[PDB]
Amino acid sequence: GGYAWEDEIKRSWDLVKVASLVASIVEARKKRTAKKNITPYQRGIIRSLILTLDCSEAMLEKDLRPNRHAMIIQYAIDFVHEFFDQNPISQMGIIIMRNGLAQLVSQVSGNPQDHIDALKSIRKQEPKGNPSLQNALEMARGLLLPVPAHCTREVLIVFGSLSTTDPGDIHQTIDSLVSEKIRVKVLGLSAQVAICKELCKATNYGDESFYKILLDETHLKELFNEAVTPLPVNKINKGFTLVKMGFPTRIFEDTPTFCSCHSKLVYGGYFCPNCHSKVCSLPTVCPCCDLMLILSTHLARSYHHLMPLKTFAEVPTTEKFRSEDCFSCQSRFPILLTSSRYRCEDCKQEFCVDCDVFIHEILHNCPGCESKPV
Amino acid sequence: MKFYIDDLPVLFPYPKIYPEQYNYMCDIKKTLDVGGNSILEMPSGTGKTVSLLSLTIAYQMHYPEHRKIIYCSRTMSEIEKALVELENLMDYRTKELGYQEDFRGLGLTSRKNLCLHPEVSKERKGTVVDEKCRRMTNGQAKRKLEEDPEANVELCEYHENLYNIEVEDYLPKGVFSFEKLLKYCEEKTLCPYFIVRRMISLCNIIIYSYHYLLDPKIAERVSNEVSKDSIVIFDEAHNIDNVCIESLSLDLTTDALRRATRGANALDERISEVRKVDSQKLQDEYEKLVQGLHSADILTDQEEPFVETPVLPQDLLTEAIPGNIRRAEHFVSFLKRLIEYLKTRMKVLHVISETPKSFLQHLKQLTFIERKPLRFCSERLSLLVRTLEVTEVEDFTALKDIATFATLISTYEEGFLLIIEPYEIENAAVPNPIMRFTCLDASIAIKPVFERFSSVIITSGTISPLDMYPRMLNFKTVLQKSYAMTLAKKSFLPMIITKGSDQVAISSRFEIRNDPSIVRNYGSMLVEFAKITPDGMVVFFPSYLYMESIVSMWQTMGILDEVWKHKLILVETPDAQETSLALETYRKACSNGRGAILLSVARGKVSEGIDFDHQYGRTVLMIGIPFQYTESRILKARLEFMRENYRIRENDFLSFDAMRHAAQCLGRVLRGKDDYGVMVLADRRFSRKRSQLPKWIAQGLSDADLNLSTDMAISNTKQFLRTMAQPTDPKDQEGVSVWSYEDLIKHQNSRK
Ligand code: SF4
Ligand SMILES: [Zn+2]
Ligand SMILES: [Zn+2]
Numbered sequence A: 001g002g003y004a005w006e007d008e009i010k011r012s013w014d015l016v017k018v019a020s021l022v023a024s025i026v027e028a029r030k031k032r033t034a035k036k037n038i039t040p041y042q043r044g045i046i047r048s049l050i051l052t053l054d055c056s057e058a059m060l061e062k063d064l065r066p067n068r069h070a071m072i073i074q075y076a077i078d079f080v081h082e083f084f085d086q087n088p089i090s091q092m093g094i095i096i097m098r099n100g101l102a103q104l105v106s107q108v109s110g111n112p113q114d115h116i117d118a119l120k121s122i123r124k125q126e127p128k129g130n131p132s133l134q135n136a137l138e139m140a141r142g143l144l145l146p147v148p149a150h151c152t153r154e155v156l157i158v159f160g161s162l163s164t165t166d167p168g169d170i171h172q173t174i175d176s177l178v179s180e181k182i183r184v185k186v187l188g189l190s191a192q193v194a195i196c197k198e199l200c201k202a203t204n205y206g207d208e209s210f211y212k213i214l215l216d217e218t219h220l221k222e223l224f225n226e227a228v229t230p231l232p233v234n235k236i237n238k239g240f241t242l243v244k245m246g247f248p249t250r251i252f253e254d255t256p257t258f259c260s261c262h263s264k265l266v267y268g269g270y271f272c273p274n275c276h277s278k279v280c281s282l283p284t285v286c287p288c289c290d291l292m293l294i295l296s297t298h299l300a301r302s303y304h305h306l307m308p309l310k311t312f313a314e315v316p317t318t319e320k321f322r323s324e325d326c327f328s329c330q331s332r333f334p335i336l337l338t339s340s341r342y343r344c345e346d347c348k349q350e351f352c353v354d355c356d357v358f359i360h361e362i363l364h365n366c367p368g369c370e371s372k373p374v
Numbered sequence B: 001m002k003f004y005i006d007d008l009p010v011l012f013p014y015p016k017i018y019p020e021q022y023n024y025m026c027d028i029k030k031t032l033d034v035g036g037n038s039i040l041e042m043p044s045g046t047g048k049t050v051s052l053l054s055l056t057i058a059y060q061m062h063y064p065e066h067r068k069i070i071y072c073s074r075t076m077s078e079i080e081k082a083l084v085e086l087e088n089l090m091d092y093r094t095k096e097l098g099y100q101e102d103f104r105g106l107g108l109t110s111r112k113n114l115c116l117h118p119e120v121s122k123e124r125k126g127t128v129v130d131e132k133c134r135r136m137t138n139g140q141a142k143r144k145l146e147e148d149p150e151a152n153v154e155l156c157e158y159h160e161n162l163y164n165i166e167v168e169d170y171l172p173k174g175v176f177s178f179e180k181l182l183k184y185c186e187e188k189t190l191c192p193y194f195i196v197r198r199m200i201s202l203c204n205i206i207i208y209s210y211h212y213l214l215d216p217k218i219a220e221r222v223s224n225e226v227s228k229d230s231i232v233i234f235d236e237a238h239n240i241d242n243v244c245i246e247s248l249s250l251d252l253t254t255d256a257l258r259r260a261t262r263g264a265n266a267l268d269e270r271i272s273e274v275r276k277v278d279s280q281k282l283q284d285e286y287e288k289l290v291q292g293l294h295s296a297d298i299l300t301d302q303e304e305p306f307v308e309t310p311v312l313p314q315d316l317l318t319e320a321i322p323g324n325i326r327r328a329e330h331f332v333s334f335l336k337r338l339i340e341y342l343k344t345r346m347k348v349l350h351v352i353s354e355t356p357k358s359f360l361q362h363l364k365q366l367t368f369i370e371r372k373p374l375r376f377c378s379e380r381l382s383l384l385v386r387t388l389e390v391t392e393v394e395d396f397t398a399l400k401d402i403a404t405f406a407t408l409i410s411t412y413e414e415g416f417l418l419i420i421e422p423y424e425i426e427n428a429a430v431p432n433p434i435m436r437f438t439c440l441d442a443s444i445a446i447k448p449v450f451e452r453f454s455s456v457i458i459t460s461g462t463i464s465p466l467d468m469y470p471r472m473l474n475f476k477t478v479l480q481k482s483y484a485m486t487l488a489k490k491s492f493l494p495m496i497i498t499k500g501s502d503q504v505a506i507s508s509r510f511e512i513r514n515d516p517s518i519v520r521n522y523g524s525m526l527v528e529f530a531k532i533t534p535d536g537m538v539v540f541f542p543s544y545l546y547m548e549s550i551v552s553m554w555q556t557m558g559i560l561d562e563v564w565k566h567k568l569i570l571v572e573t574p575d576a577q578e579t580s581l582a583l584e585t586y587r588k589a590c591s592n593g594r595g596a597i598l599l600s601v602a603r604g605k606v607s608e609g610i611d612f613d614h615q616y617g618r619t620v621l622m623i624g625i626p627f628q629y630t631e632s633r634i635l636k637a638r639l640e641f642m643r644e645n646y647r648i649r650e651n652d653f654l655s656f657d658a659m660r661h662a663a664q665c666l667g668r669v670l671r672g673k674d675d676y677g678v679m680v681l682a683d684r685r686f687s688r689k690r691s692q693l694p695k696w697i698a699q700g701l702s703d704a705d706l707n708l709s710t711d712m713a714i715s716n717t718k719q720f721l722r723t724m725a726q727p728t729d730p731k732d733q734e735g736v737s738v739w740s741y742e743d744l745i746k747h748q749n750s751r752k
C-alpha cells in the first residue's frame, strides 16, 4: 500500500527533449474548398428582426469575461452597428427576458441610434429572475404583426438558461409562429435545449443549422456576425411584390425649420417627393404619406448579396503563370515548391492572397473582370 | 435499402445502415443456417429490433421452409415497440415489392389489456377480469340460454360476434399493433383477446412476453399452438433467470391458509347441497374419473381449468387418479387435512430450510397423505369445481394457492427448497409467519424451450458476461460475441464517482443509509448535475426503501428545494398507474423545455423497458450498486445452490447480478448514434467493476474516469455537453459510422 512518494520522481525535465511551407498552403487550399460552393441564392434584403436577449439568473455566471450579461450586451451594441451598416433599409426591435416576463426596450424602427441608447441603458441593470421563451416569442409575434408582407420577419434569440418557465403551452406558440411565417434563430450559451431545437427546426422548414451553441468567446463573435447577412428565402414561400418608395433630394437652407418627424428645428433635411415634408435622416418612413424614403446608395449596398462574386480557385504549380506580380496590387509573389497565385475564372487573372481576401470581403467586384472589354 | 447476403435478399427499411447492424445481421443469418443457439450483445445506440426483424422476416419469405418467427420480450410495452417496428418493415416491403405479401403479425397479452367490455374492463386486477370474461364465455351461459331463453345470465357481444365469421377472416392480412388492433376491433365489436389467441397458429410472427413462454400456467396453451421449427428470439434477456425462477415459486401466509379453510368448508357445504338435489353430476364425473380420463378429455376447448397447471407439461403424470381423491367428499377431506398440516407448520420459532423430500416424509408421518395424490391435487380440484356449478368462485379462490403448493412440492425434489420463517418482516410487533416455496435452478423452466426449438437467438443490449448465461442456464451456443459501436465521435460519457466534493467516500450500503455525510454528498451531486443537465435527468436507486429514506432526508435538509428551481421532481411509486402518469408528466416537461428529474428504482418498473432517448435522457445518475438484499433466505439458498452445482462463487454472482441491473439502466439512454448523454456511477465500489460492464460501455470508460469527484465530474460533464452540441462534420462519419448502399457493397467486396 505504498504511496506515490515512494514510487519515483516525476522528472519533468525528461518530458521535454531537444514541407513546413507546404503545410501553410494546403490549409489555405482546403479552406478555399469550403468557400468554393457559392451560388446566387435568393435573399430577403428587407428584414424585420426582433432581437431577444436573455437577462436572468443564469446570465450571472462567470464563464464569459466579465459575465454573460455584460458581454452579450457589449456584443449586442456591436451587432446593431454592423447590422444597419449592411442592411440600411431594414428595421430592428429589442426585447429582453426578466423575472419571467418579456420587457420591450426598443420599438421596431430604422434608426440605429435609438437601439444603441436602449442597449446601453440595459447594460446597467443587474439581471435576475427566470427566463420565459413564450413571453418573449408572444411579444415578438405582436411586434412583427404591423409589418408588410414583403419584409422578412425574423427573431434572433440569445438564450443562456437550460430551463424555461412559461405560463402557457409553448408548442401552440411555435405553431402560431410557423403560421405567421416568422423565422427564429437561437444562439445558446451552455448546451442544447429540446424546445429551442424544435423551435429553430420547425420554424425554418426543418433546417437544424439555425440553433448554434458557442465554444468560446471568439466563436461567439463569429455567430453574432453571421446573423447580419440576409437569410435566404424558401422556394415555396413566395411573396413577390412591388414596394412604393421615393428618392428625396437633399436641401441646404439658410434658416432652421421644423421637422415633420420630431417637430424639432433642424437646419437641413431631405424633402419627400410625395408631400414635400422634410425628414432629418434616412432611411425612414415618411411621417405624413407613409412612403419609404431612401437614397440610391442604400439600394446599392445590397447588390453584392444578389450577384455574389464567384470564388477564386487555386492554380496548380504544374502549369506556367502569366505574370510575376499581382494584377491589382503588383505584390511580388514569393517563390517559396508551391504557388500562391489565385486566378479568377471569369477573367483568368492572377491575384495575390492579400487581394483575394480583400476583394471578397471589402470590395465586391473583381478588378480584372471590370477591366476586360467584352 | 435492399442489399444482398450470401443468398438471402433483405430489405432494410432505411436508406442508411450502421456497420454494426450489417455485422449483427450477418451473424444472425449464420446462426439460423448452421442451427443452434447464440448470444449476441449489441450496443443500445444502434437499431437492434429493426435489424432483427429485417433479416428474420426476409429469411422466412425467401427460404422454402418459411419458418415462423417467435419474438419474446420482458414486458408488454416492448411488445408494442416491436410491433411498431414490425409494421414499419412490412410497409416498406409493400412499397418496394409493389404488393402486400401474405403476412400476419400479432401480439399476445392478457385480457386486462385487450378487454373492450364496458363493465368487465373497469377492474383493478386481471384475475377478476379473467373470472368475469370466463363466466360470459365459458359456455354455461350459452347452454343455459339455449335451454331457457328466460335465463338472466348475460353474454359478451364481442365474443358472440366472432362465431359469425371464420377464424381466417378475423383480421385482414397485415400486422396489427395493440393500438391498431383495439381500434379495428372496436369498430366491429370483436374481442381482441380471443382474436389473437385463436389466430396464433396462422401468424407468421407472434410476439409475447417471457411469461407466456416460461411460466407453465399460461405457457402450455400458447406453446401448443406455435410451430416446432419456428425461429425463437429472446430480446432483452439479460434478466431471463429471474423470470424462470419465479415461474415455479410460491409464497404461503397465515391469512392464505386461514382463507383456504373457509374455502374448503364452503366446498364441503356446496357438495352437500348439490348431493341433495342433483347427485347425477357427481356420479357422471366419478364414472369418467374411474375410466382414467384427465382434465384435457373432460374439459371442452372453450373452457379452461379452474387451477392452472403449476408444473411443466412433461412432469405431469399420465396415469389415472390414485383413488384416494376420486370422490368429491373424500377429496375435500384430503384437501382439508392438508391445509391443517400447513397451518401447524407455520408455528415455528426459527427459520427452517427443508427439501421437498423431507417435507413429504413429515407429512406422511403426521398425516397419511402420499406423494402421488398431491401431484393430482390441482388436476382433481379443477374437475370438482367445474362440475359443481361454481359460477361465483370468490370463496374458492384461496384454494388455488393450496392446490398449487401440493402439486409443485410433490413434483420436483431437486433444485427446489422450502423456507419457513416466523417473521416475514423483521420490523414487526407480532410475528407474521410465512412459508416460501423457492426454485433455485433457473434452467428447469427454460429446459423445455431449448429442447423443443432448434434455433434460438439470445440478444440484448447489456448481456455481459456472455459466458455466465450458458453456465447459469444449461445450454450451449454455436457462437457468442459482443459488438463495439464504430462511432466517429464519442456520444456517451461513462464516469465513476467514488467521493464527493469534500473527498469523503460515498456508498449506498444499506447499513449506513441514514448517514449525514453520505446523504449530503449524494444530494449535492443530484443538485449539481441538475444545474447543467439541459432537459432530462434520470436517477436510479438500489432499492425503493433506500430511495424513500434518502429522499425524505433530502427534503428535511432542504436539498429538494434547490432542485425544484431547475427541474420538476417526478418520483416512482408502488402504484403502476401513478408511475405511468409520472412518466407522461416527465416526458412532457422535457419536451416543453421546463426540465424534469425522475427518481426511480434500478430494479423497478421503469428500468425494465422504459427508455429515455434524446431529450428525455441526458444524464443517468446511478446512486450506488443495485445490490440485492444480502440477508435474505431466498438469495442465500440460491447462492449456495449455484456454488455447489455450477461452481459459481457467491460474491461473483452478487456482483454479476448487481452490475447487469446497473448496465441495464445505462443502456436506456441511447437510440441512434446522434443521441448523447452522460452516465455517472456514484459509488466507491464501481471503481473495480469496469471489466464487469458491457464491452461497449467499458470501451467508453477511460482510465482517468475510474475514480472521480463530484466537482471533477461536473467539469467534464459541462465540457462534454458543450462539445456534443456542435454541428457534426459529415465527412467525419460518411463511411466509418454510417454506411450508404455503395459503402456496404464496398465492405462486401473487400471482405470477399
Ligand atoms: S370476451 Fe373479450 S371483451 Fe368480452 S369480457 Fe372477455 S376479454 Fe372482455
Ligand atoms: Zn426630426
Ligand atoms: Zn412624404
Ligand SMILES: [Zn+2]
Pocket (backbone or CB within 6 Å): A326, A327, A328, A329, A330, A331, A351, A352, A353, A354, A355, A356
Ligand atoms: Zn494583390
Ligand SMILES: [Zn+2]
Pocket (backbone or CB within 6 Å): A344, A345, A346, A347, A348, A349, A366, A367, A368, A369
Ligand atoms: Zn475576374
